[PDB]
Every structure is written in structure tokens, then in C-alpha cells.
Design a protein around this nucleic acid. Sequence first.
DNA 1: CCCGGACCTGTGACAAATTGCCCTCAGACGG
DNA 2: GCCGTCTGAGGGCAATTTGTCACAGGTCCGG
Length: 213
Amino acid sequence: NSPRIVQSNDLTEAAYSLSRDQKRMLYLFVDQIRKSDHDGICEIHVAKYAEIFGLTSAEASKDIRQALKSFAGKEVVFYYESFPWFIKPAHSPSRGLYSVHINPYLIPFFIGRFTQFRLSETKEITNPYAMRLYESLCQYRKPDGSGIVSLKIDWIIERYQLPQSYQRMPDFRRRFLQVCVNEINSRTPMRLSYIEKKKGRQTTHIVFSFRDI
DNA sequence: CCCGGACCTGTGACAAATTGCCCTCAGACGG
DNA sequence: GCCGTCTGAGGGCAATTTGTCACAGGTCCGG
Ligand SMILES: [Mg+2]
Ligand SMILES: [Mg+2]
Ligand SMILES: [Mg+2]
Ligand SMILES: [Mg+2]
Ligand SMILES: [Mg+2]
Ligand SMILES: [Mg+2]
Ligand SMILES: [Mg+2]
Ligand SMILES: [Mg+2]
């Protein structure tokens, strides 16, 4: 059925800041690259993007165009080593068609210890931080569909590049943790719960348990 | 001892960002 | 060779969500 995304854990655990629209495009690049027999040159069709994510052609065009120009200057850190995503601006040879030049030094980090999920699992998620959380949980999923993992809060803040006010724990709870656990439970086939680990007055880890519906 | 102080929690406000919608009009193609 | 239609590249919108901070209200420490 739907496209099966796979990626090296090094990408799941990398430090970067991307929007929802950019992350959506990134899944197709990883799919194109992996399906190959490099050049790092990928392509996106407006009308295909619209059908995949149930958008109109117009709003697809707006999403691709603005996503594409917001990649400029974005950088990726693997814990460390920093790379730019793109080494040339995007451009459109034909109407409804975009051509992009991914940094060929990124290829081995995409294909290597791996993470996998079908694209239908994530295509209704809205908050990009919630996409990051669902990817990290998939990294620990078992064949049958369950798993349990303890993630450190400081590592969450670094890897997902959360904004500065979420270093105050009550804001972390209200605007990130609760919201992203609610989307996953509402928008994916996963059912997720958690509990907090403490040391003194400080909360240090979050312990996630999940099963499949 | 009661205090001021250094931690922690959650909630009420407001500011800045993102969402799916809507409308226009020229490009690429076929009847 | 023109034209009606299917696209998609632009300009926008109000309704929600996300990002930030002041203040109320708990504990323990040391003086
Ligand atoms: Mg958009
Ligand atoms: Mg402490
Ligand atoms: Mg006593
Ligand atoms: Mg008093
Ligand atoms: Mg706008
Ligand atoms: Mg009261
Ligand atoms: Mg007080
Ligand atoms: Mg309290």
C-alpha cells in the first residue's frame, strides 16, 4: 500500500529545526534517494504532492514554494558535525515541477540501526515537534507494535531544538508534551501514555509506553 | 524561631505564527 | 489557428495554535 519510509537512526536523533511542510518534503527525498541504483538531485511534482496530503494544487504550490526558500541557511548536526541541507537553490524547469540539490555528503546519513514507518502514519500530524516524537518512538517499536523508552529532557530540548521558554518546565508540559501526545493519540494508529521521572525537585526524563491499535 | 530567598507548580494574558480558505489570471494542452 | 478548460503562481483573510511572561501559591533552607 502506502510508501514505506526508512531512515538511519542518525537522522531520527539529529539536531535540526524544520517546519511541517519541510518535513513532509524531506520524507519524499529520503524515499527517492533510497530507491536508487549519487547525484542527490531529487524532484517534486505539485499535483502529486497535493494528492498525497489531500491538498489543492494552489495550496500545494504555496507550501512547496515557501518551504523551499526557507531551507536556505538551515543546517544539520549529528552528534558533532554540521552540514547544510542544500548546496544550490531550488529551481523549476517546468510548470508544476521542482528540482532540488541535496548535499551529497548527507547521503550516507540517510542510508546506513534503523527507523521505519509508513507515510500514512504521519501525514495528518500538524505540529512538527510531534512528528519528531513519533519518529523517535518508532525507532524503538517492536514487530508486534509496542515499545517502551525513557528519553532525557535535555536531550529532547537539544535534538528537537525546542524554543527557549520551554526550559521552564510548566511551559514544556503545557505547549509541547501534552499537545504532541494528544495529536499522536488522535492522528496516528498508536496509543501513547507517559510518566515523569524525577530527581529531587527537578524532572529529568519522560518514560513513554505505547501499543498499536 | 518567622523571615526573605531560591526552588518548584499551574493559570490568565497577550503577541506572533500557522492553519485551511478564498479569489485572480496567465501557462500548457486538447477538442 | 483559436479557445475552454485544467493548473498553479500570485495576492490576500479570519479563526486557532504556538511562544512568552507576570503573578498566585506550595516546599525547604539558613539566619
Ligand atoms: Mg500553507
Ligand atoms: Mg534543585
Ligand atoms: Mg518544631
Ligand atoms: Mg506576614
Ligand atoms: Mg498570508
Ligand atoms: Mg486563592
Ligand atoms: Mg510566597
Ligand atoms: Mg505548587
